[PDB]
Write a protein that binds this ligand. Sequence first.
Ligand SMILES: CCCCNc1ccc(C(=O)OCCN(C)C)cc1
Lengths: 149, 156
Amino acid sequence: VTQTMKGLDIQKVAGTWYSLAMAASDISLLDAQSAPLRVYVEELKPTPEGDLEFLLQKWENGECAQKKIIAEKTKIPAVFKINKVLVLDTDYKKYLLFCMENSLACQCLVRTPEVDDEALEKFDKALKALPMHIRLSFNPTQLEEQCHI
Amino acid sequence: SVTQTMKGLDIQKVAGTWYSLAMAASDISLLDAQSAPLRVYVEELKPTPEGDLEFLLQKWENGECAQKKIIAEKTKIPAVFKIDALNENKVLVLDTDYKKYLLFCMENQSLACQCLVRTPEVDDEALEKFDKALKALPMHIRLSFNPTQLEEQCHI
Ligand SMILES: CCCCNc1ccc(C(=O)OCCN(C)C)cc1
């Protein structure tokens, strides 16, 4: 992943998000509820030091676990270290596109638990240069359920 | 569910070798596991003397790769077939050029579609036409397979 967001203002990504769609380089990264990169972003909280706190849900040992993880800033405003987190694009008010790279998985986040045509079209365009072998998308009912069940 | 069928399908010309390059389904659970209900790999098509279409496929069953044969019976629409199985179903051929790619769906309402290729290689045209076809359909999971997997039992 090289195409990261120019001019990111991380403070404007604060608040609630919903994982609408995800894609990964390897089927095993996303295929099961327990798959390693099957994670649902529920909130982003930029820190006073310019780090990025993720609140996510992840299926572990038969429960939907909530995790709070700090992604530490790097010299590239759009790149953090949790894996590298790369923010490809956001309009702050509607969508955010990011990837996790070690293996590669990318997500389309939306501000409201609804399908957004613009967000998904931009996600598809961003994935054209990336060697993805699994793509998932979630319905509005799933977005509001613990671990998108 | 599926609006697009192949006009003027000649089932004799779809006969022979195929490989499942990509698949997509309306419900993640139809395709997410090696054991998922619509996770099947088409290896060969055989038209019958009655104009039915026999699918020779691989399916993960009892933790091993099994060979299975499924007859999709002809209907009054050339590109639409029906498997004698408990559940109401349709097999729909969306598009083929016969010599490189074939796009089909299974409707059960559950829906899964596949991109078949003649040669066990990633084909840009096959995948681009598959993706265009899927824009019309409410898919929540898409898988694609590397050329090594195409020639392994059950795409392992
Ligand atoms: C650049 C403007 C940043 C303003 N911040 C926000 C603006 C909007 C939202 C938000 O969630 O809006 C959803 C409603 N649709 C119409 C936008 C969340 C944060």
